[PDB]
């Protein structure tokens, strides 16, 4: 009886941001720059866009030229540093 | 002259240098600007009369004092 | 369906 | 993995190099152009899988491998 009633019930009742997840290989940076970013635990765009300029400058081996390249490639993809994210992770 | 002649602060910069951390990594670790690190390293260079950090590091490691 | 379930009511639980 | 596959003589030269020897004096002493000296040190840098001489020299000294 329980089975039959439970079975009848059907008749009675009813009638993001992809670019932040993009792999670092898509970033097309210099080999040294990519290696340094990976060594600094920078493997995702989602965190990277949240980071600031000075933090990248404080990376021991990256120079102003590296910052210039990263800024140029971010601008060519409509992005930049220090963008604020909400409801992390996406 | 002698590494023990340094101040505790200068001992800290000296030990961080001997541990292989670069100057900006030293600035990060101690949360100071590059200028103070430069000041400390230039005083070490002047007092120890040396040309590079590597010679001081290898001399520190030579006697296996630790 | 309502009528039939109403009949089984005494046994369901 | 093992450094000893290289020549011990160039290892002794390299210990002298990590003893603060600048590239210009290296080329003057070894009778090769500075380009060849840089090529040699570059080779040693990748062959040891290192990014800087400080860590490698410290590691060599601490266990006294050679």
Curated annotation (Swiss-Prot), chain A:
N6-acetyllysine modification, residue list: 64-65
List of residues that carry ADP-ribosylarginine: 32
Domain of life of the organism encoding this protein: Bacteria
PTM summary: Acetylated on Lys-64 and Lys-65 in the presence of glucose. PatZ controls acetylation of Lys-65 but not of Lys-64.
Intrachain S-S bonds: none
Purpose of the protein: DNA-dependent RNA polymerase (RNAP) catalyzes the transcription of DNA into RNA using the four ribonucleoside triphosphates as substrates. This subunit plays an important role in subunit assembly since its dimerization is the first step in the sequential assembly of subunits to form the holoenzyme. Part of the processive rRNA transcription and antitermination complex (rrnTAC). The complex forms an RNA-chaperone ring around the RNA exit tunnel of RNAP. It supports rapid transcription and antitermination of rRNA operons, cotranscriptional rRNA folding, and annealing of distal rRNA regions to allow correct ribosome biogenesis.
Protein family (similarity comment): Belongs to the RNA polymerase alpha chain family.
Domains (record comment): The N-terminal domain is essential for RNAP assembly and basal transcription, whereas the C-terminal domain is involved in interaction with transcriptional regulators (such as CRP) and with upstream promoter elements.
Subunit structure: Homodimer. The RNAP catalytic core consists of 2 alpha, 1 beta, 1 beta' and 1 omega subunit. When a sigma factor is associated with the core the holoenzyme is formed, which can initiate transcription. Both the N- and C-terminus interact with different regions of transcriptional regulator CRP. The rRNA transcription and antitermination complex (rrnTAC) consists of RNAP, NusA, NusB, NusE (rpsJ), NusG, SubB, ribosomal protein S4, DNA and precursor rRNA; S4 is more flexible than other subunits.
Name under which the protein is recorded: DNA-directed RNA polymerase subunit alpha
Organism: Escherichia coli (strain K12)
Curated annotation (Swiss-Prot), chains B, D:
Spans through the membrane: none
DNA bind region: 23-42
Domain HTH luxR-type positions: 1-64
Top-rank lineage group of the source organism: Bacteria
General function of this protein: This protein activates the expression of the nitrate reductase (narGHJI) and formate dehydrogenase-N (fdnGHI) operons and represses the transcription of the fumarate reductase (frdABCD) operon in response to a nitrate/nitrite induction signal transmitted by either the NarX or NarQ proteins.
Name of this protein: Nitrate/nitrite response regulator protein NarL
Organism annotation: Escherichia coli (strain K12)
Lineage: Bacteria, Pseudomonadati, Pseudomonadota, Gammaproteobacteria, Enterobacterales
Residue window of the full protein shown: 151 to 216 of 216
From Swiss-Prot, chain C:
Domain of life of the native organism: Bacteria
Signal peptide span: none
Post-translational modification: (Microbial infection) ADP-ribosylated on both alpha subunits by the phage T4 protein ModA. ADP-ribosylated on only one of the alpha subunits by the phage T4 protein Alt.
Family the entry assigns: Belongs to the RNA polymerase alpha chain family.
Entry remark concerning the domains of this protein: The N-terminal domain is essential for RNAP assembly and basal transcription, whereas the C-terminal domain is involved in interaction with transcriptional regulators (such as CRP) and with upstream promoter elements.
Cited function: DNA-dependent RNA polymerase (RNAP) catalyzes the transcription of DNA into RNA using the four ribonucleoside triphosphates as substrates. This subunit plays an important role in subunit assembly since its dimerization is the first step in the sequential assembly of subunits to form the holoenzyme.
Quaternary state and interactors: Homodimer. The RNAP catalytic core consists of 2 alpha, 1 beta, 1 beta' and 1 omega subunit. When a sigma factor is associated with the core the holoenzyme is formed, which can initiate transcription. Both the N- and C-terminus interact with different regions of transcriptional regulator CRP. The rRNA transcription and antitermination complex (rrnTAC) consists of RNAP, NusA, NusB, NusE (rpsJ), NusG, SubB, ribosomal protein S4, DNA and precursor rRNA; S4 is more flexible than other subunits.
The name this protein goes by in its record: DNA-directed RNA polymerase subunit alpha
Source organism of the structure: Escherichia coli (strain K12)
Full-sequence portion shown in this chain: 221 to 233 of 329
């Amino acid at each position: 009886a329980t089975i039959l009633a439970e079975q009848l019930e059907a008749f009675v009742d009813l009638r993001f941001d992809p670019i932040l997840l993009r792999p670092v290989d898509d970033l097309e940076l210099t080999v040294r720059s990519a290696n340094c970013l990976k060594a600094e635990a920078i493997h995702y765009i989602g965190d990277l866009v949240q980071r600031t300029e000075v933090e990248l400058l404080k990376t021991p081996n990256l120079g102003k030229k590296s910052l210039t390249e990263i800024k140029d490639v971010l601008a060519s993809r409509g992005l930049s540093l220090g963008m604020r994210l909400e409801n992390w992770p996406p | 002259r002698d590494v023990n002649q340094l101040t505790p602060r200068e001992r800290d910069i000296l030990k961080l240098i001997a541990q292989g951390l670069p100057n900006k990594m030293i600035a990060r670790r101690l949360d100071i600007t590059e200028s103070t690190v430069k000041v400390h390293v230039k005083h070490m260079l002047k007092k120890m009369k040396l040309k590079s950090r590597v010679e001081a590091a290898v001399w520190v490691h030579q006697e296996r004092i630790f």
